[PDB]
């Protein structure tokens, strides 16, 4: 995150860390949607143009963390993957359309003060909150700047959803209905953005109706970090919810 702040303790108990076994390194963020399922961006696992093709065995999930590099003994829980599921139409060849994947844990995790799942939006939540000007929140242990570094604690930043045309005119990539963009305008005199390391994390909003936190987007792609006239792009979780339901009920939950 660029121009965020340190999160408070237990502020995003659904924030997961995707961790490389060896070398030991932070791959991406992710989020806990129940006691066995994690939601992330497909391009954290599979990205052929960079020879990236992670397997179940190559990874670890770390839940309940605060600090980026310490092993938070008696706080954090580290799990193993049972299986990875990528959207069958994830489009890595052209724009990362449908950048989403589920990870089924080897065993259910136990909730605690620092570990708790976020909700998945229903059609009506999506309809009231996904609006231009409304703010969401992104969290992650990624870069502090486009190039220099690494925070020592989970960072946060609140950002406004931006109107589709402003999104489309800021880039040359073809934007689809499975993506939305967020960020302040050069005008606005306020900064912020996800950056390298943040991918796969959650863009969340808190419903004013029922007081619950919902995950509306997944940190997906951007051009640089925090550049003027550029926005971050997020996978639209509600549009992809039926592939989500399908996998959860055809294979576990």
């Amino acid at each position: 995150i660029v121009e965020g702040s340190d999160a408070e303790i237990g502020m995003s108990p659904w924030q997961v860390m995707l961790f490389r076994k060896s070398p030991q390194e932070l791959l991406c963020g992710a989020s806990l949607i129940s006691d066995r399922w994690v939601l992330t961006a497909a391009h954290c696992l599979l990205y052929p143009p960079w020879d990236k093709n992670f397997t179940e065995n190559d990874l670890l999930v770390r839940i309940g963390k605060h600090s980026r590099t310490r092993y938070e003994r008696n706080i954090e829980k580290i799990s193993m993957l049972e299986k990875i599921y990528i959207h069958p139409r994830y489009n890595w060849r052209e724009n990362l359309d449908r950048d989403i994947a589920l990870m089924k844990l080897k065993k259910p995790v136990a909730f605690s003060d620092y570990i708790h799942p976020v909700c998945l939006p229903d059609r009506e939540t999506a309809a009231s909150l996904l609006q231009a000007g409304y703010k969401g929140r992104v969290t992650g242990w990624g870069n502090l700047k486009e190039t220099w570094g690494q925070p020592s604690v989970l960072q946060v930043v609140n950002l406004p959803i931006v109107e589709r045309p402003v999104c489309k005119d800021s880039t040359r990539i073809r934007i689809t209905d499975n993506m939305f963009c967020a960020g302040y305008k050069p005008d606005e005199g306020k900064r912020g953005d996800a950056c390298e390391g943040d991918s796969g994390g959650p863009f969340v909003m808190k419903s004013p109706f029922n007081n619950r936190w919902y995950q509306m987007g997944i940190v997906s792609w951007g051009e640089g970090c925090d550049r003027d006239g550029k926005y971050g792009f997020y996978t639209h979780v509600f549009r992809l919810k039926k592939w989500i339901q399908k996998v959860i009920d055809q294979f576990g939950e």
Binding site: S22, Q24, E25, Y71
Partner: peptide, 10 residues
Amino acid sequence: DFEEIPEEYL
């Protein structure tokens, strides 16, 4: 820079 994790996890 990553602190070592228990081996029970590798």
